């Protein structure tokens, strides 16, 4: 504040070499106010760069909460030159005048052969317009988003000729090798330039279209081949960009901007550290309630008629009809629907059969997910924000001193909302109806506030502080709702509404391109943490030593207690001896370490925060307090979890090894039962034998099962299972944290003991079929292979996204994704209303569904049948999809022929003949004849 001013800034860019917070307990609110005044790029390079793995992961996290960019990932030359050149190129973004600034925008995987939820060409168009509206030299800005796509991918829809990519520059071998000095190192396995990829035979081919000072580039495909290098050689040394803008949809000196989903802190963080990145946040489409349709709407009707037909004393034969329609919807797999006529059942258990079917219908109806794609700069209207607000309203907040609207509505009847959830889970009809009633109440109250503030039309600053939501609570039939507590809640909701609707997204890119400082903010779930709003920020993860919090720990025990109750029930009442779990960064950022804390509770351990609130110690809980045996664990940590949270991997390994060393009876402590046995067989100590914390080798990510399944490049499940064991068997060691050696003997011996597999669902938008990561990390069939007795483990997936914690089977969860996403009209019509890129979203869910067949066999045959029915046997929808996007439609057909070809889909010879023609029809369209 003293030396970078005199008043004006006398600095175009700051490079911190302290490798601390700006203001130290670190204070980020002050540091942010300071760096926003100066309003220049903040760069930080850790001292460690210039001279282990835990201290690096604890350190690098702090500057990120300050909004820092990182110009770093033998002589000093490399590092010094890197930091230097990047600071100059950052400063040059103030020096250079607007009308001379050149802004490369790079697109990945077009034509399409993460859960971004991004209309790419939609968003680029808005960014090109925004750039023009601000005096950048944008030449010949086309008429529409489609015309823009038409300019890059000529005949993308394959009406007339093959889709092919606008060649923006041919690059001789002379120019490639001269300007790309590392071109030789690529020659090992791609040979002499130009190779077979992005080659005409003599030159490499840079794909895109120049629009004056904006260049829209394409890299359809990814050591990387000469074409991939050649593209970044063009941007850097030939087109000479001053900034490049990527979309987060992977791993020179010019500034590197990503538009990343606000709901993906973890990958955003990997980009900050791997590609020198600055990660501006965009909102995922305004979520809608999934709704009911076809057979499921019909059943909601039958059930709606059951309370009235009891008043007529007929209420028997309807339950027979209810059970039959429930059976056609395949809800027989999610509710126990015993083969017993209603007449032969008492009153109690007829109600309970309905309550059961109705709560699973309500789960489907009320699931909150996006049903379309986001254009950058086009925020949700107040109406499309109501559903989002409903669930924001449905969470108790101690740190905002407000209670969930549903808690207050239940309190008004002297009712605990936890008791209702658990009674709704049991299928007690009375409490299913009460819950659906309270939900409808909550939906209306919040809709009243939004409708009130539409026609206040910005004349009052806060419409919540002048009322129609006490009306729409009384109209609903809950008149005694404590008004002292409604006041602050609807104050919050109105604020939350305003942040959702904010249009700061284009603003953030401007600031970055001017050479200003972009306001940092938390990545996460908007619904669980509204401070993720508004978007347009350089989003950060969080202090890896701030988790888990006492709330996350407490919620963890409920989930674990619930997983163990469900696993005993489906296994004669015997606790499992080992649970195999995945840990992702993403859900632990969004829940302040719940999933992490669940694994702690399994072995009976609690995290011990110090004086300053840092979680850097762990201890065993006595058996008295656990009230059950210590369950053994196999923890598969993602590479991303490793990168952000290796400190927690350290605690988990400490916890497990204290469990194994503990002087407890083996039947009360399964870690020690297993460790003792494995110690003797392997000829080692009990502590070395208690190795349970695993990841990819340092520098690696994923099992590569995602790549094999995307490339249909695998013969049998044993290949998938083989590379998993090769790639995922790197053992963390809290007694030697630097040495993460391969330990496949231990990985096999541990997994061998697994009775169940377990993950935590991120969110409804990053669910099991939206991405490929959950299935890539799934060890379910692997475990059935390794077990001497060949038995498949029970697969469970926890969901703590709403106030109502479910622990579902993997099958339940795959069904619920199929019913709400792929096979849901609202979901597929919403996606198809965006054209080309709509089809891409459809094939994604279907490809990720195939994945689950390969790793778990968790996919019901009906999911594939109904996919074929909805999208292929409907001659309208089929021709529509093909005309809309050949490349993605070809992928939809491949996927259905594949799941049959491999043994996951049994279906009519007729269905297979159609697909086999349709694949020939669309190969012709794409490749010529």
């Amino acid at each position: 504040n003293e030396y970078f001013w005199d008043p004006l800034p006398i600095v175009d860019a700051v490079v911190s070499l302290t490798g601390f917070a700006l203001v130290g307990r670190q204070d980020h609110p002050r540091a942010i106010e300071s760096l926003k005044k100066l309003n220049r790029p903040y760069m930080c390079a850790l001292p460690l760069v210039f001279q282990h793995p835990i201290q690096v992961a604890l350190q690098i996290a702090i500057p990120e909460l300050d909004g820092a960019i990182e110009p770093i990932i033998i002589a000093l030359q490399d590092r010094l030159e890197a930091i230097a050149q990047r600071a100059m190129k950052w400063a040059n973004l103030r020096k250079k005048p607007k009308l001379d600034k050149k802004v490369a925008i790079t697109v990945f995987s077009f034509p399409p052969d993460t859960a971004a939820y991004l209309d790419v060409f939609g968003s680029i168009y808005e960014v090109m317009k925004g750039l023009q509206g601000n005096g950048y030299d944008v030449q010949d800005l086309p008429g529409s988003a489609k015309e823009l796509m038409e300019a890059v991918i000529h005949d993308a829809q394959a009406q007339y000729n093959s889709p092919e990519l606008n060649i923006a520059h041919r690059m001789s071998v002379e120019q490639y090798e001269r300007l790309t000095p590392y071109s030789v190192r690529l020659e090992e396995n791609w040979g002499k330039p130009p190779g077979h990829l992005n080659s005409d035979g003599q030159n490499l081919l840079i794909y895109g279209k120049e629009f004056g000072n904006v260049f829209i580039g394409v890299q359809p495909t990814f050591s990387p081949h000469h074409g991939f290098a050649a593209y970044y050689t063009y941007l850097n040394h030939i087109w000479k960009a001053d900034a490049v803008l990527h979309f987060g949809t992977e791993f020179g000196t010019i500034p590197n901007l990503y538009y990343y989903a606000a709901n993906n802190p973890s990958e955003a963080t990997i980009a900050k550290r791997r590609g020198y990145a600055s990660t501006i946040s965009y909102l995922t489409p305004p979520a809608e309630n999934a709704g009911l349709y076809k057979g499921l709407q019909e059943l909601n009707e039958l059930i709606g008629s059951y309370q009235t037909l009891k008043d007529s004393g007929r209420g028997i034969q309807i339950v027979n009809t209810i059970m039959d329609q429930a059976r056609i919807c395949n809800l027989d797999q999610d509710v126990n629907l015993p083969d017993i006529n209603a007449e032969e059942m008492d009153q109690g258990q007829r109600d309970t059969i309905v309550g059961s079917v109705y709560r699973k219908l309500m789960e489907i109806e009320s699931r909150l997910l996006p049903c379309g794609l986001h254009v950058i700069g086009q925020p949700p209207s107040a109406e499309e924000a109501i559903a989002t607000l409903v669930n924001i309203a449905s969470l108790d907040r101690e740190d905002e001193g407000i209670w969930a609207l549903p808690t207050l509505i239940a309190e008004s009847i002297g009712r605990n909302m936890e008791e209702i959830y658990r009674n709704s889970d049991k299928g007690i009809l009375a409490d299913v109806e009460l819950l659906q009633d309270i939900t409808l109440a909550t939906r209306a109250a919040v809709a009243a506030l939004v409708q009130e503030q539409i026609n206040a039309d910005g004349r009052v600053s806060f419409v919540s502080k002048l009322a129609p939501w006490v009306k729409s609570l009384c109209d609903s039939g809950y008149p005694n709702v404590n008004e002292e507590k409604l006041k602050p809640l609807f104050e919050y909701l109105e604020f939350c509404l305003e942040q959702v609707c904010a249009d700061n997204e284009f603003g953030g890119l401007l600031q970055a391109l001017e050479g200003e400082y972009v306001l940092p903010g938390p990545g996460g779930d908007p619904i669980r943490n509204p401070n993720v709003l508004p978007t347009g920020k350089n989003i950060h993860a969080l202090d890896p030593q701030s988790i888990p919090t006492l709330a996350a720990v407490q919620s963890a025990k409920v989930v674990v207690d619930r997983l163990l109750e469900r696993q005993r029930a489906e296994n004669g009442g015997n606790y499992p001896e080992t649970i195999a779990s995945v840990l992702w960064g993403t859900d632990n950022i969004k829940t302040y370490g719940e999933s992490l804390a669940q694994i702690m509770w399994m072995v009976g351990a609690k995290p011990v925060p110090d004086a300053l609130g840092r979680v850097n110690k762990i201890e065993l809980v006595p058996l008295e307090e656990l009230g059950r045996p210590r369950i053994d664990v196999v923890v598969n940590c993602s590479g991303v979890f490793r990168d952000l949270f290796i400190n927690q991997m350290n605690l988990l390994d400490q916890a497990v090894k204290l469990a194994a060393e503990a002087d407890e009876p083996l039947e009360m402590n399964f870690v020690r039962k297993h460790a003792l046995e494995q110690a003797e067989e392997m000829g080692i100590g009990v502590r070395e034998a208690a190795t349970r914390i695993f990841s990819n080798a340092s520098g690696s990510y994923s099992s590569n099962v995602n790549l094999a399944v995307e490339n249909s490049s695998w013969e049998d499940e044993s290949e998938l299972q083989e590379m998993y064991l090769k790639r995922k068997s790197f053992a963390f060691n809290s007694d030697n944290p630097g040495m993460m050696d391969q330990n496949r003997d231990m990985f096999e011996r541990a997994l061998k003991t697994a009775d169940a597999t377990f993950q935590n669902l991120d969110s409804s938008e990053i669910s099991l079929t939206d991405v490929s990561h959950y299935f890539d990390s799934d060890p379910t069939k692997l475990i059935s292979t390794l077990r001497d007795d060949g038995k498949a483990p029970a697969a469970y997936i926890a969901d703590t996204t709403t106030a109502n914690a479910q622990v579902r089977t993997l099958s339940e969860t795959v069904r619920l994704d199929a019913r709400t996403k792929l096979l849901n009209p609202k979901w597929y019509e919403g996606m198809l209303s965006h054209g080309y890129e709509g089809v891409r979203e459809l094939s994604k869910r279907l490809v990720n569904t195939m994945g689950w067949s390969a790793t778990a066999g968790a996919v019901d045959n009906w999911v594939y049948e109904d996919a074929n029915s909805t999208f292929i046997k409907d001659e309208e929808m089929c021709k529509r999809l093909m005309d809309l996007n050949p490349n993605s439609f070809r992928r939809m057909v491949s996927t259905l022929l594949e799941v049959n070809g491999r043994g996951y889909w049994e279906t009519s010879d007729e269905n297979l003949e159609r697909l086999q023609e349709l694949y020939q029809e669309v190969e012709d369209r794409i490749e010529g004849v």
Binding site: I54, D610, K617, E619, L620, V621, P622, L623, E624, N650, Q654, L658, E661, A662, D663, E664, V686, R687, N733, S734, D735, N736, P737
Partner: protein, 292 residues
Amino acid sequence: MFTNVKSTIRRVDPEALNGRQLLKVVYVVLESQYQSALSAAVRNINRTNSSLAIQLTGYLIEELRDPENYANFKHDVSEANLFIASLIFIEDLADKVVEAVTPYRDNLDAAIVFPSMPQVMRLNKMGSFSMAQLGQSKSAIAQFMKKQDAMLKLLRTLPTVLKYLPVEKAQDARNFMLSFQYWLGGSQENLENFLLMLTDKYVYPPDMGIWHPLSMQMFENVKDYLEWYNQRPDISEDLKDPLAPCIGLIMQRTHLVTGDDAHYVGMVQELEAMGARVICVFSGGLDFSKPV
């Protein structure tokens, strides 16, 4: 067992020395919590610190009954830098411990015995300091022991003794008192600092605030300090009286960080013995007008 988590491990070894110096620690104790806290402390130092590694061997006192155990104990004492003992109140084993340790008294860079039978307490050796140099409060504590209170009687005695010693033999007595204060702390990082303090001094050589030797925490304001002061049980009510003579001391944070504060401690005790309430301010800076 059901209500107290206990370990089957007595021995913690660094997984790999690398470049680092090895410290060898034997302990004899009655409490399972101090056993496991030392393990946790040693085990944290081994995984984080890049010049020091610690080997820890020890027995709960009862385990020395077997000759299997007692024999490895003797051999471990032979190689040890630090010997630690605490709460050893059985005539039988007491003497096994004395026999085992007595030879290596000169070997050991230090021997720390917290409240045990008098025979064991005479093993106490920290540079020039032993139980001998307790002025005439060797007599008092020696015989209170023979019969947690015990831990505090010896703690509050230690400042009264510093004045009757020359300065080096007083810092050694203070170093003892610090190490006893850490032990009573009993936290993992308490025992980490305990082992790094003894290693630093005897084996391998807030910007401002209020300090009292008998408080583990600094105070950043007067209200907290006095609230703490009034709850002290070791002082006459006379000193809590607001009409009591109150003397300000000014000192350098340096010496409170270093632990080289023997004369500062002895000053505070002299003034308290005279019936003076004491406020000792420090600063890390050169402007002592701030804390004044």
